[PDB]
Design an enzyme around this catalytic site. Structure first.
Site, mmCIF file in Angstrom:
data_model
loop_
_atom_site.group_PDB
_atom_site.id
_atom_site.type_symbol
_atom_site.label_atom_id
_atom_site.label_comp_id
_atom_site.label_asym_id
_atom_site.label_seq_id
_atom_site.Cartn_x
_atom_site.Cartn_y
_atom_site.Cartn_z
ATOM 1 N N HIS A 52 44.485 40.025 45.173
ATOM 2 C CA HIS A 52 43.381 40.850 44.575
ATOM 3 C C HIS A 52 42.856 42.074 45.577
ATOM 4 O O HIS A 52 42.369 41.451 46.800
ATOM 5 C CB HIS A 52 42.234 39.844 44.225
ATOM 6 C CG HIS A 52 41.156 40.664 43.392
ATOM 7 N ND1 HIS A 52 41.355 40.481 42.042
ATOM 8 C CD2 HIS A 52 40.231 41.418 43.514
ATOM 9 C CE1 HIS A 52 40.125 41.110 41.365
ATOM 10 N NE2 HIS A 52 39.615 41.820 42.498
ATOM 11 N N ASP A 89 40.561 45.851 45.341
ATOM 12 C CA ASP A 89 39.774 46.613 44.499
ATOM 13 C C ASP A 89 39.796 48.157 44.779
ATOM 14 O O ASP A 89 38.767 48.778 44.658
ATOM 15 C CB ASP A 89 38.433 46.239 44.233
ATOM 16 C CG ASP A 89 37.921 45.061 43.838
ATOM 17 O OD1 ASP A 89 37.506 43.801 44.222
ATOM 18 O OD2 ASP A 89 38.430 44.804 42.472
ATOM 19 N N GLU A 149 39.396 41.912 35.758
ATOM 20 C CA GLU A 149 38.560 41.060 36.498
ATOM 21 C C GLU A 149 37.393 40.767 35.522
ATOM 22 O O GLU A 149 35.944 41.214 35.599
ATOM 23 C CB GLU A 149 38.085 41.663 37.791
ATOM 24 C CG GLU A 149 37.447 40.404 38.667
ATOM 25 C CD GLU A 149 37.063 40.809 40.109
ATOM 26 O OE1 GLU A 149 37.338 42.177 40.440
ATOM 27 O OE2 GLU A 149 36.598 40.349 40.811
ATOM 28 N N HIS A 184 33.899 37.769 35.456
ATOM 29 C CA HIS A 184 33.256 38.477 36.463
ATOM 30 C C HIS A 184 31.913 37.653 36.921
ATOM 31 O O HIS A 184 31.871 36.314 36.869
ATOM 32 C CB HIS A 184 33.153 39.944 36.777
ATOM 33 C CG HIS A 184 33.052 40.310 37.927
ATOM 34 N ND1 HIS A 184 31.804 41.139 38.424
ATOM 35 C CD2 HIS A 184 33.601 40.451 39.368
ATOM 36 C CE1 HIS A 184 31.849 41.531 39.781
ATOM 37 N NE2 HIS A 184 32.947 40.975 40.099
ATOM 38 N N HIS A 242 35.858 33.746 40.260
ATOM 39 C CA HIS A 242 34.462 33.956 39.456
ATOM 40 C C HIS A 242 33.920 33.109 38.180
ATOM 41 O O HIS A 242 32.884 33.049 37.761
ATOM 42 C CB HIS A 242 34.512 35.361 39.064
ATOM 43 C CG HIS A 242 34.323 36.429 40.234
ATOM 44 N ND1 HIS A 242 33.290 36.781 40.463
ATOM 45 C CD2 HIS A 242 35.331 36.826 41.045
ATOM 46 C CE1 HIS A 242 33.191 37.583 41.600
ATOM 47 N NE2 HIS A 242 34.380 37.738 41.760
ATOM 48 N N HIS A 252 41.185 34.948 44.078
ATOM 49 C CA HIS A 252 40.447 35.166 45.358
ATOM 50 C C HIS A 252 39.371 34.408 45.369
ATOM 51 O O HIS A 252 38.289 34.454 44.645
ATOM 52 C CB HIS A 252 40.037 36.566 45.430
ATOM 53 C CG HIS A 252 39.105 37.402 44.464
ATOM 54 N ND1 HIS A 252 39.679 37.631 43.164
ATOM 55 C CD2 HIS A 252 37.983 37.803 44.256
ATOM 56 C CE1 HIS A 252 38.764 38.018 42.368
ATOM 57 N NE2 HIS A 252 37.687 38.256 43.086
ATOM 58 N N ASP A 264 40.654 39.875 48.448
ATOM 59 C CA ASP A 264 39.759 40.549 47.991
ATOM 60 C C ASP A 264 39.250 41.817 48.832
ATOM 61 O O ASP A 264 38.186 42.336 48.840
ATOM 62 C CB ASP A 264 38.357 39.698 47.739
ATOM 63 C CG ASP A 264 37.305 40.134 46.906
ATOM 64 O OD1 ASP A 264 37.725 41.148 45.944
ATOM 65 O OD2 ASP A 264 36.285 39.607 46.929
HETATM 66 FE FE LIG Z 1 37.223 42.471 42.621
HETATM 67 FE FE LIG Z 2 35.783 39.774 42.610
#
Ligand SMILES: [Fe+3]
Ligand SMILES: [Fe+3]
Ligand SMILES: [Fe+3]
Ligand SMILES: [Fe+3]
Lengths: 382, 381
Positions: free
Chosen positions: B20, B22, B131, B158, B200, B221, B291
């Site tokens: 993961h 972003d 996500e 999430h 999550h 993650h 992450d």
């Molecule tokens: Fe993320």
């Molecule tokens: Fe996250």
């Protein structure tokens, strides 16, 4: 069988008849609500509509642009309606792909001139996708590029709704008077990504402007001739001439209201008159077939459903249209346009032209950005 | 160092595939997804833990790039959910454009085989995850189209509850795990070959999904609860159920998940978490899920994507065998993706029915009668 019927069958075997527009996927939404599990018998022999898999075989159709149409947004909240159309669009693309994947002996997905041919060599109906109106992208050029990635190869600029990009023919008053500034800029992006432009449903002025601006040939996926039948949805002599210069193709429609002033008087002969009018005046390399089967309740006499294509081919030959010209009208012309749309895209992408980007809201304030830049320099000092 | 040369050799032999990152959302934040003329900045970013030079520097083999968009914030929930779907398409768009404009560095991958060929060609295998099921706007049709756009995992939540599952960080619980819709969606995810991601999600949602799934899942993650108690970390119960599921927990670099004081988190803590999991459920069920760019600041020694060779060296220094380090680096997540494909092909081979959206009727009975009347007129010709 007459010599003309055997001639027509031979032509249908030699080259694919590629129809410009069929709303069978919307009939699947209407009748089955896109649940086709255990419905094979009904998909081969439908209780409604002008399309099913047996009649599709029967008429010897070579390829089809299947319409991923969803209606113009109805909602009083324009934001919800616009966004709802995008979700519905994904539902229609989903059912088209499932229809193709569950019936691989009949249908084979195609997104190019080469994939049309290999589908045709394998005895399959080359199955392409169009969306019918820029209301379907919810103002997102990003979404448009993702629809291209999902297999969409033409975009009708409007349906019977004005949108942010262009004017529909059937809605008065005019919003933009043709294309908007956003519309003009979107034409460049459509050319750059290799999305075929479809001018059916758009206003005469929107057509004129798009035909001047486009760097690639366009189509009318389902429109007929204004000079034979005056209608807002038919193509004027001015726009037929500008289509010639554009190198595009007008795919002649089977809509009864576009062929005759009295709908119940419309016939196969009238469709042939419209093809011959366009072929005679702008050349048979710029004319195609765009039925709009399943965008209507009832077809013309002799073109009642997808099984009737052999009668159209035979009828064209009977009027003295040459084999080579009939082959062009059947499918070679729309293949050429798709081929040129690809080549223009590869050329513009090869030269590194900037893609059109959506206008997004800022997600970070200046405090967050400062924290981010401070953090980056801390890392640089390690 | 012998251990650093060992680490470099391993990174050349097998791909380190991170669970993961972003970076796509950072591109949305900083550039608003306009990367035209921004190569210099994409190679040397003025913000964040990821850029193309540091990505090369750290010798990363592959990456699941996150197509994350935030939880819907609109009081009009219909607008909010639909808005998230449009934003998701924006994020998938910028990810594909990022890959396409930098083909010497990035190569799109959607399978175990495409990961390997990307790695053989010297590219970072570039995969995609979304996500949170808030991103699909309650449309299973949309989800299948996201799969067709290249999405290969879906984090079930999430930091918001959705119609399918409970998030870990939001109380009170809505569904108490998965909803009835959520249970049914697990079958469809398995059928379509979408990898399930349990990061999550609530502890109970994990337990229920781990029992129900017919394919191995991941935590893209998440870290270990027994070393650091947090709602986002995986309990010993769920680690055991992950073992049975044959899934992989991809250990997170989030400071808050590694130590009670975030400023005390380190590379050593990440290694403790990998070793804890590997010791208890086997090194074939542990991965790396940084992450990066889902946080402002990384742990000491794992500040950005250039730091992966330090993690590999640190694992070897703690006595984890080469073969087990290779598993943790990427072989395990490749296996899971492989098994997810195989389960999908098997279920699609048996002709299992796909989950369909509940649609509104569009034709009234008058229109339907006209259609059947018309069809019978045609039959009489
Ligand atoms: Fe993320
Ligand atoms: Fe996250
Ligand atoms: Fe239509
Ligand atoms: Fe139409």
């Amino acid at each position: 069988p007459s010599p003309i019927e055997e001639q027509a069958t031979r032509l249908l075997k030699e080259v694919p008849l590629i129809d410009g527009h069929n709303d069978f996927p919307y009939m699947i939404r209407g009748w089955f609500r896109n649940d086709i599990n255990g419905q094979d018998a009904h998909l081969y022999d439908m209780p409604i509509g002008q399309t099913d898999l047996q009649r599709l075989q029967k008429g010897l159709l070579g390829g089809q642009f299947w319409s991923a149409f969803v209606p113009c947004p109805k909602n009083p909240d324009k934001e919800v309606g616009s966004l709802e159309a995008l979700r519905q669009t994904l539902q229609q693309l989903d059912v088209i792909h499932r229809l193709i994947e569950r019936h691989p002996t009949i249908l084979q997905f195609a997104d190019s001139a080469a994939s049309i041919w290999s589908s045709f060599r394998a005895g399959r109906v080359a199955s392409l996708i169009g969306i019918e109106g820029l209301h379907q992208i919810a103002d997102s050029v990003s979404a448009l590029r993702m629809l291209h990635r999902l297999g969409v190869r033409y975009v009708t600029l409007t349906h019977n709704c004005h949108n942010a990009f262009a004017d529909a023919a059937t809605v008065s008053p005019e919003l933009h008077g043709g294309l908007s500034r956003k519309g003009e800029r979107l034409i460049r992006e459509l050319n750059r990504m290799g999305m075929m432009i479809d001018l059916s449903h758009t206003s005469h002025e929107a057509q004129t402007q798009a035909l001047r601006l486009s760097r690639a040939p366009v189509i009318y996926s389902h429109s007929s001739i204004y000079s034979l039948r005056a209608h807002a949805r038919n193509v004027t002599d001015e726009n037929l001439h500008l289509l010639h210069r554009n190198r595009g193709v007008v795919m002649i429609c089977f809509l009864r209201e576009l062929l005759a002033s009295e709908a119940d008087q419309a016939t196969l002969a009238h469709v042939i008159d419209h093809i011959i009018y366009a072929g005679t005046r702008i050349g048979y390399e710029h004319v195609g077939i765009g039925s709009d089967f399943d965008g209507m309740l009832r077809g013309p006499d002799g073109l009642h459903d997808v099984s009737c294509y052999p009668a159209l081919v035979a009828g064209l030959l009977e009027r003295g249209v040459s084999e080579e010209d009939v082959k062009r009208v059947m499918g070679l012309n729309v293949i050429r346009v798709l081929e040129e749309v690809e080549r223009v895209a590869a050329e513009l992408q090869g030269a590194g032209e900037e893609c059109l980007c959506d206008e997004l809201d800022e997600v970070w304030n200046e405090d967050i950005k400062e924290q981010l830049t401070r953090e980056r320099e801390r890392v640089r000092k390690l």
